[PDB]
Amino acid sequence: RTGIPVNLSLGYDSLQGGWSGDVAYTNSNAFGLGHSFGVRLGAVQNQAGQNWVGSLNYTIPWLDLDFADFRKNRTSLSFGVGSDVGGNIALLDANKEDTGRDYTTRTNGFSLGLGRNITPNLTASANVAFNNRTSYLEPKQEGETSNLDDAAATALLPATSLTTRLSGNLNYDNTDNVNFPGRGVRAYGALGYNVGRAGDAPLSWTDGEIGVSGYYGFGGRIKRSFGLETYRQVLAARANTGTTTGTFPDGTGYFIGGSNPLASRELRGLEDGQLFGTNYFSSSLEYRYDFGLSGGVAQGLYGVLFADYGGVWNSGEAFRSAYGVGAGVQLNLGFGGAQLPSLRFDYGYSGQNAQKPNGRFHFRIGNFW
């Protein structure tokens, strides 16, 4: 019975695809000396050619090479062989046309990562990854305004690029828990330099992203006897920024808009990935109130009234941004012996939305952040 896949992770990310499901088999102890072996295999609703993604990581805690001072709790060495898909990416060219059908990317990557723990709050890592990116044109999914043919569009696909990316990450957390942070600050900073051959020309660039978040409880005491104490009301304020400098192939940048599982690119009230920019800044503030419901079939329920502001700009300085105001509810279901992934339903409005003068709904399967 292939042992156990720890999770059939049901993930939603409207940017990449309709729905996603990943089965993950982890094995903490392997080869007899505490080696962690994980295999992920997922299916992502691509409405396109490629439908299966995969990953295979193998990580080493307590590497003692007796080289480069590696004597303290400072070594985690991880191999990763993976293949992911980027879906529904708009098709562009030197004319910056919008009449292309679509553009799906297969990324086959081999990565080596060295991870360090400075203080139990802090974490750092350095990953070097060789990525092969291939393209797959698709015909129309349905009736949309376009005028192209297969041959010219296939010619318009960027060639299979071979790139190498060396990056570092630094994460700082001192919060009281992982799901409903009462009092603390969570910050992170990533920076990566990469270089690769797209067709016959070599393009090299770099990118970075910083982000801070603060959570302060507001006069509450809820006691899950197992789960310590969390405030009834918590004010959360986050600000994230990102940049990309250098020369890069077309189709690389950042998309902000709507709700997204990664908190640093979510702008409720717009179309998913409506704001595209080479560098960006977003920030939001929200009341989060824990509805006093526990047990039963719903492990918990929280509500949020948020205000969000952010936007993108390009090398030509034009700070194109948007507003967002809305109300959301997160529900955690646990009637399966173990916690199934939480759901988040939000209603948001933005003044910069084009075809929706009224607000709309955002569905995200993800943590509360």
- Structure-block tokens of residue 255: 């998309």
Q: Which is nearer to its own copies, 27 or 204 (CB)?
A: 27
Cβ pair 327, 302 in contact under 8 A: no
Q: Does 221 bind its own copies (CB under 8 A)?
A: no
Q: Does 3 bind its own copies (CB under 8 A)?
A: yes
Smallest distance, Å, CB 103 to its own copies?
A: 23
Q: Does 297 bind its own copies (CB under 8 A)?
A: no
* Cα–Cα–Cα angle for 149, 150, 153, rounded to 5 degrees: 85
Q: Which is nearer to its own copies, 43 or 298 (CB)?
A: 43
Smallest distance, Å, CB 338 to its own copies?
A: 4
Q: How many residues bind its own copies (CB under 8 A)?
A: 21
Q: Which is nearer to its own copies, 37 or 172 (CB)?
A: 37
Task: Quote the radius of gyration of the chain (alpha carbons, Å).
Answer: 22
- Check residue 258 and report its DSSP letter: B
Separation between Cα atoms, residue 127 and residue 305, nearest integer Å: 37
Smallest distance, Å, CB 10 to its own copies?
A: 6
Q: Which of 15, 43, 56, 327 binds its own copies (CB under 8 A)?
A: 43
Cβ pair 350, 323 in contact under 8 A: yes
User: Which 49-88 positions form the footprint of its own copies (CB under 8 A)?
Assistant: 51
Separation between Cα atoms, residue 77 and residue 126, nearest integer Å: 10
Q: Does 118 bind its own copies (CB under 8 A)?
A: no
Q: Does 141 bind its own copies (CB under 8 A)?
A: no
Smallest distance, Å, CB 147 to its own copies?
A: 24
Smallest distance, Å, CB 341 to its own copies?
A: 7
Q: Which of 4, 112, 178, 318 binds its own copies (CB under 8 A)?
A: 4
Q: Does 295 bind its own copies (CB under 8 A)?
A: no
In the block, tokens 């955690």 appear at 332
Strands 122-136 and 222-223, by their bridges, are unpaired
User: Which 307-366 positions form the footprint of its own copies (CB under 8 A)?
Assistant: 336-341
Which residues lie across from 40 on neighbouring strands? 24, 55
Q: Which of 8, 162, 178, 228 binds its own copies (CB under 8 A)?
A: 8
Nearest alpha-carbon partner for 349 in 320, 330, 323: 323
| Torsion sign (Cα): 369, 267, 344, 40 | negative
Strand, coil or helix: 30: coil
Q: Does 143 bind its own copies (CB under 8 A)?
A: no
Separation between Cα atoms, residue 22 and residue 7, nearest integer Å: 7
CA dihedral 278, 268, 354, 144 (to 10 degrees): 80
User: Which 226-255 positions form the footprint of its own copies (CB under 8 A)?
Assistant: none
Q: Which is nearer to its own copies, 28 or 99 (CB)?
A: 28
Q: Which is nearer to its own copies, 113 or 300 (CB)?
A: 300
Q: Which is nearer to its own copies, 1 or 221 (CB)?
A: 1
Strand, coil or helix: 155: helix
* CA distances to 6, 13, 82 from 38, in Å: 10, 23, 11
Q: Does 2 bind its own copies (CB under 8 A)?
A: yes
Q: Which is nearer to its own copies, 124 or 333 (CB)?
A: 333
Q: Does 9 bind its own copies (CB under 8 A)?
A: yes
Q: Which is nearer to its own copies, 25 or 309 (CB)?
A: 25
Smallest distance, Å, CB 226 to its own copies?
A: 18
Smallest distance, Å, CB 334 to its own copies?
A: 9
Q: Does 6 bind its own copies (CB under 8 A)?
A: yes
Q: What ranges in the chain are assigned the alpha helix state H?
A: 150-156
Separation between Cα atoms, residue 348 and residue 343, nearest integer Å: 16
Strands 202-218 and 222-223, by their bridges, are unpaired
Q: Which is nearer to its own copies, 43 or 128 (CB)?
A: 43
In the block, tokens 């109300």 appear at 327
Catalog residues that contact its own copies under the rule CB under 8 A. 1-10, 23, 25, 27, 43, 51, 336-341
